Amino acid sequence: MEMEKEFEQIDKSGSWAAIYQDIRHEASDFPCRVAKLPKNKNRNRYRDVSPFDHSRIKLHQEDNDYINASLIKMEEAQRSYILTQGPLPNTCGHFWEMVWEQKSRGVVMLNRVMEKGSLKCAQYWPQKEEKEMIFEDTNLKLTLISEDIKSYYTVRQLELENLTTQETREILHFHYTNWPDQTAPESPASFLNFLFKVRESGSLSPEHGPVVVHCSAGIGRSGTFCLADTCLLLMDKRKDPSSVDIKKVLLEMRKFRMGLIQTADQLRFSYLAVIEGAKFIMGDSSVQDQWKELSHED
Ligand code: VO4
Ligand SMILES: [Mg+2]
Ligand SMILES: [Mg+2]
Numbered sequence: 001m002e003m004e005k006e007f008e009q010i011d012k013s014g015s016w017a018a019i020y021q022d023i024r025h026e027a028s029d030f031p032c033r034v035a036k037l038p039k040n041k042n043r044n045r046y047r048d049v050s051p052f053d054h055s056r057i058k059l060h061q062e063d064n065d066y067i068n069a070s071l072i073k074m075e076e077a078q079r080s081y082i083l084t085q086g087p088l089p090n091t092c093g094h095f096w097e098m099v100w101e102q103k104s105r106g107v108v109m110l111n112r113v114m115e116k117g118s119l120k121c122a123q124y125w126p127q128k129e130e131k132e133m134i135f136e137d138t139n140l141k142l143t144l145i146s147e148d149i150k151s152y153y154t155v156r157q158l159e160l161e162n163l164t165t166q167e168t169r170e171i172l173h174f175h176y177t178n179w180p181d182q183t184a185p186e187s188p189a190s191f192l193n194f195l196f197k198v199r200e201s202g203s204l205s206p207e208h209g210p211v212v213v214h215c216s217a218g219i220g221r222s223g224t225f226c227l228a229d230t231c232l233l234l235m236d237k238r239k240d241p242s243s244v245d246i247k248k249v250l251l252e253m254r255k256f257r258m259g260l261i262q263t264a265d266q267l268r269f270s271y272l273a274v275i276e277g278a279k280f281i282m283g284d285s286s287v288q289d290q291w292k293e294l295s296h297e298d
Pocket of ligand 3: 088089090
């Protein structure tokens, strides 16, 4: 309720840029010494996007444990996320090793492999059932099991096999294919429809390891997704929408990974998504069918 008042004040005063720059100025700053080691230069997609040492995910190999990935551990909300860059051609083995070792059940992908004429992500999952991928460095096998393609997102069932142990796991892939870099989604409705398909999959359950979330850098669209989910979960826990302070939640998230939410419009969208999602949290279950309709997923 009180985020709604703040939304109006910021809008009718046109101060989203200043509000967002405030968050940037107050955000935590922690060292990234491991990410900056010369042996890890080719493991980083962007020179200026690095995991903090204190929250980085360590791979369980002894040669080089480095991956550009952060554990966002939201203590009060009791949910964790792994935010990571889009894998590089040499880090797709590391990416699936991380998924395996962290016992993630779901991967949320918010970018496309090619954006604005550039390769933003390696093709790290198989596109055809009969063309499985084997990651020889990490001894993992990945098979496409099935694929449900909708108008602006795709859900895939993957089988991930630890070839050392021959243990197998189902990994769910939630691929938002309609969300351009540095922008807000089309509508809260289509975003919330997607978020709630991730939730209903069980991939966010505490019984599993943290969901893996990535875009190209793992901060902008990835930060928007996590901020909206954590805010909705916080108000759900308290059944009190007015108790949620969005900027404080984002600032808390930015203790674990730098640059989360990259534009003022993405921040503004985050308010809109949470305000609209609160309708469902607070007991208007019919609104979820309305999101499905408005998102035109077929
Ligand atoms: O690829 V993202 O720029 O939305 O961090
Ligand atoms: Mg590379
Ligand atoms: Mg690779």
